[PDB]
């Protein structure tokens, strides 16, 4: 078990080399989301391309809340979606070749980690009940 995070800094202002506007950043967020990126990809392309550190700091709020205010809300939340697509990629590989028991054990682990935050997102009810995981 290791410790590799990003250290979110002690300052909560714009860094004052940021000469831009806080509205052009939101227009850039809705542009990238309309052209089709997940909020992690939105934030990383924003971090590296046009020097906004973090949109909660510079803009008003966090960027899934920006997409919810501009009508681009994700159908299934991003963590659950990526674990869905990973679990179905492993299930495709397993139906392909059926002696990868390491892939079967990893499928068990991915399905359990599907169930845990499907439970969390159902009891907070971001996604509705009678959500089955196919």
């Amino acid at each position: 078990k290791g410790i590799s995070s990003s250290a979110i800094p002690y300052s909560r202002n714009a860094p004052a080399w940021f000469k831009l506007s806080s509205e052009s950043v939101i227009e850039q967020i809705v542009k990238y989301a309309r052209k089709g990126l997940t909020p992690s990809q939105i934030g990383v392309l924003l971090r590296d391309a046009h020097g906004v550190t973090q949109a909660r700091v510079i803009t008003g709020n966090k960027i899934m809340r920006i997409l919810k205010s501009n009508g681009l809300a994700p159908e299934i939340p991003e963590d659950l979606y990526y674990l869905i697509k990973k679990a179905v990629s492993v299930r495709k590989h397993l139906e392909r070749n059926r002696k990868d028991k390491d892939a079967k054990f990893r499928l068990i682990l991915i399905e359990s980690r599907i169930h845990r935050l499907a439970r969390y997102y159902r009891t907070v009810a971001v996604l509705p009940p009678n959500w089955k995981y196919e």
Binding site: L94, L107, E111, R119
Partner: protein, 211 residues
């Protein structure tokens, strides 16, 4: 670097040149013009490869004399798990080195258990003895059984008669141990518990059952 003058003297009485190249870390033996023995360069080859395999020098220049030979028994490829492998190799070395020193005495050989191989020097009867002992110790039969058989066979070789009778009626290594042959039903184990790649679903919790 300290024992090198003694290797040079021990080979120069046999007319073989030898160099120690520390900038690569090598040792070469070379037949000179005055070398009148053809097969002495192979014993010098054994000598430098023993000094590389880290036997001592006074135990190493016993290879330049005719009744002696090297051997490197290979034991890495006998068993699967590392626990069983290291326990059988420590069974070969023995409690406080007793099994190894007793085998050295009984076969008149010099044995080094090193890594996953077992080096040995000595006479040829001793080398065949130690090879079958080491391979039988890497299979399951204990080396003290072979050492008991060696003591028995030594005492039977030092009598004048009984020199053309088979000694299997003396040896205890014949034990008649083949007493496993099961009679279980194979009721399921013929073809049952068929394999699927997909696991079934999980039993959900209480609050999952209420949502």
């Amino acid at each position: 670097k300290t024992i090198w003058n003694d290797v040079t003297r021990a080979l120069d009485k046999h007319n073989i040149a030898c160099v120690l190249d520390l900038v690569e870390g090598s040792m070469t033996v070379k037949t000179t013009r005055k070398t009148y023995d053809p097969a002495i360069i192979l014993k010098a080859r054994d000598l430098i490869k023993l000094l590389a395999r880290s036997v001592p020098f006074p135990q190493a220049v016993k290879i330049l004399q005719d009744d002696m030979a090297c051997d490197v028994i290979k034991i890495g490829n006998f068993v699967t798990n590392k626990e069983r492998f290291v326990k059988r190799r420590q069974r070969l070395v023995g409690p406080n080195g007793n099994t190894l020193k007793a085998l050295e005495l009984l076969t008149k050989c010099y044995i080094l258990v090193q890594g996953n191989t077992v080096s040995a020097m000595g006479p040829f009867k001793g080398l065949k003895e130690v090879r079958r002992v080491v391979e039988d110790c890497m299979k399951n039969i204990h080396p003290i059984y072979h050492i008991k058989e060696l003591m028995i066979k030594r005492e039977l070789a030092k009598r004048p008669e009984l020199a053309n009778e088979d000694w299997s009626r003396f040896l205890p290594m014949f034990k008649k141990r083949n007493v496993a042959r099961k009679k279980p039903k194979k009721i399921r184990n013929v073809e049952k518990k068929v394999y699927t790649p997909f696991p079934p679903a999980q039993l959900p919790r209480k609050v999952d059952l209420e949502i």
